[PDB]
């Protein structure tokens, strides 16, 4: 499997990975997200994404949904921190018409003022549900404390931002941020490059200015508490980490697999198997372009929260002492299996291609990644871990926890 | 793609779907679940599944996790309502050794009394987290109200059952319910039938009695309230429905796709797009072998809960009046696309094969399903919907809601 990438004259980056499969999937990233919402309009990208689906060209909201449903398009979309993602999957016979409708949605949305109040009401319910999801609530507050910059914002918005956003300001925001310069379209499946290029002709009309991204700025590490009457205390840790834009990435990814990648990993072994402190514990990347971040999470009772946090923090920070030959061997075979399984689906491959393009400006081949991981030595991992220890986390707790 | 199915001499049903893919996945269902937990030991199947992973043969808990991690096995397992499922994915070179270790886990678990207290503590945290998940909490209480029989039980157990379960009673329960008679192993991927059969030799030793399943028994429909200080009211509806074991299944599945299967569906259109009442709304099957059930869910504010419940209930019960030619056309293309995409992954195909075997005793081919759906007429769907209207739901609310 090989990938082909091109920048169209308007700046849209399009990538294709052809496969012998009667199906096509894409992932379209538009560079409008919470990170570049207008000041005082936290939630604009969430409102824009919902407002797009209220009609395009001659189709109103219901006719647009029917038109894509009549093509068999299985789809989802949503505004994120750094971009708004649109995912679609369909059979190859409807290729031309699917792409014509998505170009219409992006470049000629109706944006009806009547439909806006339904968009706003839906967005406010989505934001409200975060309050009933203590794990997600804690980690969202955690990233907000970590960043002084807009990279701390919640992708669902803020209540006052969603409530005060006015129609004409939102339209002006749409005309500014829904730009092809910085947008990425990644496609996988049973379509040739020539047939895909002909289908993208309606996208050539899309025009815009380069998308703005503020620089990341960390706060100073500190501990914070959200006092809530939950059944379990939510514990969250955040550490600066390397992300994909680092020559040490494969070493850090192998060390992360040792820390948290399976049943024999450090966190599962110490927090759950031996001590029985939690059902849920994990460590996972949670950063942005320009600032990687390692987040750790555990849920437990308030009686065990102190010991859980101590063990969790000890395991992350002990990683600097290195991993063993056997630990590393297991990490390489596990990641290989995960990579092969995540390559199987065209939907997940389109998503991976798009993130690679966003973060690196190129698509990494599966063969390149597997060989780089297999051929990362123990000494390389140990040396990286000594030079880059995890220290000085932000600490967040949500639950029946004391504070001053 | 063709499937081969055989019952081994001990009663284990094994199915294989060979594919041109350097990967293998399976789904193993063991017929121990909450539905046949011993009286007073609600949670036994949850304890057994966790206790299995505390060692098998000469391997203790940590050595067992390392042994499977050294093979690159990506895996998950959990006790459900009707069975305990074990899922694994790995590359074909480790086939023989993976299956030898899973046969060891099932037939010669160590079940150490020392490890049991960690199993119980973990299971109690899992059950406790349900209290912080209002949507899941509501739907779990809903199914409990629907069934008088054990099909109402919560798969995570009950607090008193988990707390009082004793080691020797649990071992006796393991020897009774972990039986090959009723167990199902479904495999997909790059392994031949001959190589799979040789790998399953360690499973031939497994022996047991036929698994017991009580008959389903419904309660009488009624409304119940769980008063909780949540941000959103959780609304749940439950209706008797046909399940897979019905000649009307394809008609009902097409009607369900019209009701709730996408953006142009009845529920999304009326509850969300037009009225903006919710972010989340859905209808989905939720029944057991011998008793299908249709569940509907919506989350909203207490101010809108009355109108949301009215619209939700009206749309489900209005379905009896039929669907249109266009609605049906869209449903067929959408389901076709979903079926083709759900067939792509060997992991999801192993899971589908196993449920088919559990519910029907045979594996349905993709081609058979697609043709049956494409060739279900409007008149067939209309006639089925008139003969089987959704009426008289159980109604559950969780939130700041009044009750008497």
From chain A residues 148-177, the ones with a CB under 8 A of any chain B CB are none
H helix or E strand, kind and range, residue B235? strand B233-241
Contact: A334, B74; criterion CB under 8 Å: yes
The reply to whether A313 and A183 lie within a common domain is no
Say how far apart CA A398 and CA A309 lie, in whole Å.
Answer: 13
Q: Residue B257's closest CA among B194, B196, B339?
A: B339
Q: Residue A82's closest CA among A244, A250, A312, A251?
A: A244
H helix or E strand, kind and range, residue B363? none
**CA A319 to each of CA A297, A314, A381: distance values in angstroms, whole numbers, following the listed order:** 17, 9, 11
Contact: B273, A65; criterion CB under 8 Å: yes
Contact: A72, B336; criterion CB under 8 Å: yes
CA atoms within 13 A on the CB side of A264: 27
Q: Strands A84-90 and A24-30, how do they pair? A: antiparallel
CB-based contacts of A332, cutoff 8 Å, min separation 6 = A254, A373, A374, A376
From chain A, the residues in CB contact with B346 under 8 A are: 344
Helix (H, G, I), strand (E, B) or coil at B55: strand
Contact: A337, B121; criterion CB under 8 Å: no
The reply to whether B188 and B238 lie within a common domain is no
The reply to whether A76 and A111 lie within a common domain is yes
- Per residue, the 3-state secondary structure of chain A, as one string, reads CCEEEEECCCCCEEEEEECCCCCEEEEEEECCCHHHCCCCCCCHHHHHHHHHCCEECCEEHHHHHHHHHHCCCEEEEEECCCCEEEEEEECHHHHHHHHHHHHHHHHCECCCHHHHHHHHHHHHHHHHHHHHCHHHHHHHHHHHHHECCHHHCCCCCCHHHHHHCCHHHHHHHHHHHCCCCCCEEEEEECCCHHHHHHHCHHHHHCCCCCCCCCCCCECCCCEEEEECCCCCEEEEEEEEECCCCCCCHHHHHHHHHHHHCCCCCHHHHHHHHHCCCCCCEEEEECCECCEEEEEEEEEECCCCHHHHHHHHHHHHHHHHHCCCHHHHHHHHHHHHHHHHHHCCCHHHHHHHHHHHHHHHCCCCCHHHHHHHHHCCCHHHHHHHHHHCCCCCCEEEEEECCCCC
For B124, name the nearest residue in chain A, comparing CA atoms only: A279
Residue A7 lies in a domain: yes
For A275, name the nearest residue in chain B, comparing CA atoms only: B118
Q: Residue B276's closest CA among B300, B241, B312, B303?
A: B300
Query: Any idea what DSSP says for residue B365?
Result: P
From chain B, the residues in CB contact with A24 under 8 A are: none
Helix (H, G, I), strand (E, B) or coil at B263: coil
Residue B166 lies in a domain: yes
Q: Which of A125, A274, A330 sits opposite B279 (nearest CB)?
A: A125
The reply to whether A151 and A239 lie within a common domain is no
The reply to whether B185 and B266 lie within a common domain is no
Say how far apart CA B3 and CA B193 lie, in whole Å.
Answer: 10
CA dihedral angle for residue B55, residue B60, residue B66, residue B71, rounded to 10 degrees: -50
Size of interface A-B (CB pairs under 8 A): 190
Let me know: does B116 contact B51? Beta carbons within 8 Å. yes
Say how far apart CA A106 and CA A48 lie, in whole Å.
Answer: 11
The reply to whether B248 and B322 lie within a common domain is yes
H helix or E strand, kind and range, residue B42? none
The reply to whether A228 and A309 lie within a common domain is yes
For A131, name the nearest residue in chain B, comparing CA atoms only: B231
A266 near B CB under 8 A: no
CA atoms within 13 A on the CB side of B242: 18
Let me know: does A198 contact A260? Beta carbons within 8 Å. no
Say how far apart CA B377 and CA B375 lie, in whole Å.
Answer: 6
A339 near B CB under 8 A: no
For A325, name the nearest residue in chain B, comparing CA atoms only: B70
A329 near B CB under 8 A: yes
From chain A, the residues in CB contact with B276 under 8 A are: 117-122
From chain A residues 20-59, the ones with a CB under 8 A of any chain B CB are 21-23, 25, 53
Residue B217 lies in a domain: no
Among A146, A177, A211, identify where a domain stops: A211
Q: Which of B74, B90, B280 sits opposite A129 (nearest CB)?
A: B280
Q: Residue A223's closest CA among A146, A304, A307, A280?
A: A146
Among B156, B183, B211, identify where a domain stops: B211
Residues forming beta bridges with residue B76, ordered by sequence position: B87
What tokens were used for B150?
């054990």
**CA B155 to each of CA B42, B45, B57, B80: distance values in angstroms, whole numbers, following the listed order:** 8, 8, 28, 5
A90 near B CB under 8 A: yes
Q: Which residue has the tokens 């057991």?
A: B288
Residue B42 lies in a domain: yes
- The count of structural domains within chain A is 2
Count CB atoms within 10 A of the CB of residue B282: 16
The reply to whether A16 and A148 lie within a common domain is yes
What tokens were used for A256?
């992360």
Q: Which of A122, A279, A340 sits opposite B122 (nearest CB)?
A: A279
Say how far apart CA A153 and CA A141 lie, in whole Å.
Answer: 9
Q: Is A311 exposed, middle or buried, given 0-12, 13-18 or 19+ CB atoms closer than 10 A?
A: buried
What tokens were used for B373?
């759906």
Residue A232 backbone class (left: φ over 0; alpha: ψ -120 to 50; beta: rest): beta
Cα first-last separation, chain A: 57
Residues forming beta bridges with residue B218, ordered by sequence position: B147
Cα-to-chain-centroid distance, residue A263: 25
From chain B, the residues in CB contact with A62 under 8 A are: 264, 269, 273
Among A191, A211, A231, identify where a domain stops: A211
The reply to whether B198 and B89 lie within a common domain is yes
Count CB atoms within 10 A of the CB of residue B239: 23
Q: Which residue has the tokens 């980056």?
A: A13
The reply to whether A198 and A58 lie within a common domain is yes
Residue A217 lies in a domain: no
From chain B, the residues in CB contact with A73 under 8 A are: 337
Contact: A229, B229; criterion CB under 8 Å: yes
Residue A182 lies in a domain: yes
Say how far apart CA A272 and CA B325 lie, in whole Å.
Answer: 54
Residues forming beta bridges with residue B394, ordered by sequence position: B238
Residue B216 lies in a domain: no
Residue ranges making up the domain that contains B300: 222-404
The reply to whether B243 and B265 lie within a common domain is yes
Q: Which of A62, A232, A276 sits opposite B264 (nearest CB)?
A: A62
What tokens were used for A361?
């400006």
The reply to whether B49 and B91 lie within a common domain is yes
CB-based contacts of A1, cutoff 8 Å, min separation 6 = A17, A18, A19, A343, A365, A366
Contact: A122, B262; criterion CB under 8 Å: no
Q: Which residues of A264-281 are buried (b: 16+ CB within 10 A; e: fewer)?
A: bbbbbbbbbbebbbbbbb
What tokens were used for B297?
């869910």
Residue B24 lies in a domain: yes
């Amino acid at each position: 499997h090989m990938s082909r990438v091109e920048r169209l004259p308007n700046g849209l980056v399009v990538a294709l990975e052809e496969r012998d499969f009667p199906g096509v999937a894409f992932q379209l990233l538009v560079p409008a997200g919470a990170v570049n919402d207008p000041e005082g309009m936290e939630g604009a990208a969430a409102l824009l994404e919902g407002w797009l689906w209220k009609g395009a060209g001659d189709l109103d909201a219901r006719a647009l949904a029917q038109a894509l449903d009549a093509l068999g398009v299985r789809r989802s979309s949503g505004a994120g921190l750094e971009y708004t993602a649109f995912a679609a999957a369909f059979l190859p016979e409807v290729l031309d018409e699917v792409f014509r409708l998505y170009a219409l949605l992006l470049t000629r949305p109706r944006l009806p003022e009547e439909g806006l109040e339904a968009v706003r009401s839906v967005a406010l319910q989505a934001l409200l549900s975060l309050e009933d999801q203590p794990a997600r609530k804690l980690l969202s507050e955690l990233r907000r404390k970590v960043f002084r910059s807009p990279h701390g914002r919640e992708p669902l918005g803020r209540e006052e931002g969603l409530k005060g956003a006015r129609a004409e300001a939102l339209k002006a925001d749409y005309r500014r941020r829904y730009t092809p310069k910085g947008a990425i379209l990644a496609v996988a499946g049973g379509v040739s490059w020539e047939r895909l290029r002909a289908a993208l002709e309606p996208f050539l009309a899309w025009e815009g200015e380069e998308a703005l991204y503020p620089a990341p700025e960390l706060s100073e590490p500190h501990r914070f508490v959200l006092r809530r009457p939950t059944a379990q205390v939510q514990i969250g840790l955040a550490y600066p980490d390397v992300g994909p834009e680092d020559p040490g990435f494969y070493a850090a990814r192998l060390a992360l697999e040792v820390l948290s990648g399976g049943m024999s990993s450090r966190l599962f072994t110490e927090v759950r198997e031996k001590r029985g402190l939690v059902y849920a514990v994990s460590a996972f990347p949670a950063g942005v372009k320009g600032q990687g971040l390692l987040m750790a999470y555990a849920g437990t009772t308030k009686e065990r929260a102190g010991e859980t946090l101590e063990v969790l923090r000890a395991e992350v920070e002990r990683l600097a002492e290195g991993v063993t030959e056997e630990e590393l061997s297991r990490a390489k075979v596990g990641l290989k299996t995960a990579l092969v399984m995540a390559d199987e689906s065209i939907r997940s491959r389109a998503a991976s291609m798009a993130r690679d393009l966003y973060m690196l400006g190129r698509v990494r081949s599966l063969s390149e990644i597997e060989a780089a991981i297999e051929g990362t030595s123990l000494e390389a991992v140990n040396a990286f871990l000594r030079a880059h220890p995890y220290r000085d986390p932000w600490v967040g707790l949500l639950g029946e926890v004391e504070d001053v």
